Design a protein. Structure first.
Ligand code: NA
Length: 186
């Protein structure tokens, strides 16, 4: 049998995010684009390959709210990730959440759930988000600096790309913006 329980710091944070209430339709669609850009694969449908059980639960709620049929939810044994396959509508692909702080925030939330991780900050200050497309990467950094004064970097390693945050004051600002409350762990 295959376990869905990871006890990492990253999950503890992501479990707290599963519950944040949804917002406008457009805020929901921007988060979904987060998931799509961090972990989506078009070929309908979109197939989402998630490492986070919590992100995975959030995705299914995103799809419920949007009335989007989920085709399949398979857990791949280590003996992990979770493959969710989902219908979509093309208007989802083309929302631009970079110029409205609420849509951007919603979009950061999707990036981080689906492709983000963070080291336990007692040991080391490090938050990254898997995000491959350079246009999207550059727009997100601009909007982070712009709205939040957050200096985001780029990790480039072996045909992968991560958006990167080093500063704990920055990680804090970011985690508060996407909805984390129990970061009173400070
Ligand atoms: Na590190």
């Amino acid at each position: 049998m295959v376990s869905l329980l990871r006890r990492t710091f990253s999950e503890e944070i992501k479990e707290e995010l599963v519950n944040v209430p949804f917002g406008s339709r457009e805020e929901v669609i921007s988060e979904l684009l987060g998931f799509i850009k961090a972990r989506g694969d078009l070929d309908r449908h979109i197939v989402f390959s998630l490492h986070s059980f919590a992100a995975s639960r959030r995705l299914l709620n995103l799809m419920k709210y949007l009335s989007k049929p989920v085709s399949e939810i398979i857990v791949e044994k280590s003996h992990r990730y979770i493959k969710i396959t989902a219908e979509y509508s093309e208007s989802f692909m083309v929302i631009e959440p970079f110029f409205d702080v609420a849509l951007f925030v919603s979009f950061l939330r999707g990036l981080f759930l689906s492709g983000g991780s963070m080291t336990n900050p007692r040991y080391h200050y490090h938050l990254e988000i898997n995000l491959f497309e350079e246009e999207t990467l550059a727009l997100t950094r601009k909007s982070l600096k712009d709205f939040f004064n957050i200096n985001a970097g780029i990790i480039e390693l072996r045909n992968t790309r991560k958006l990167y945050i080093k500063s704990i004051k920055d990680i804090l600002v970011f985690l508060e913006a996407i909805g984390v409350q129990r970061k009173l762990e400070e």
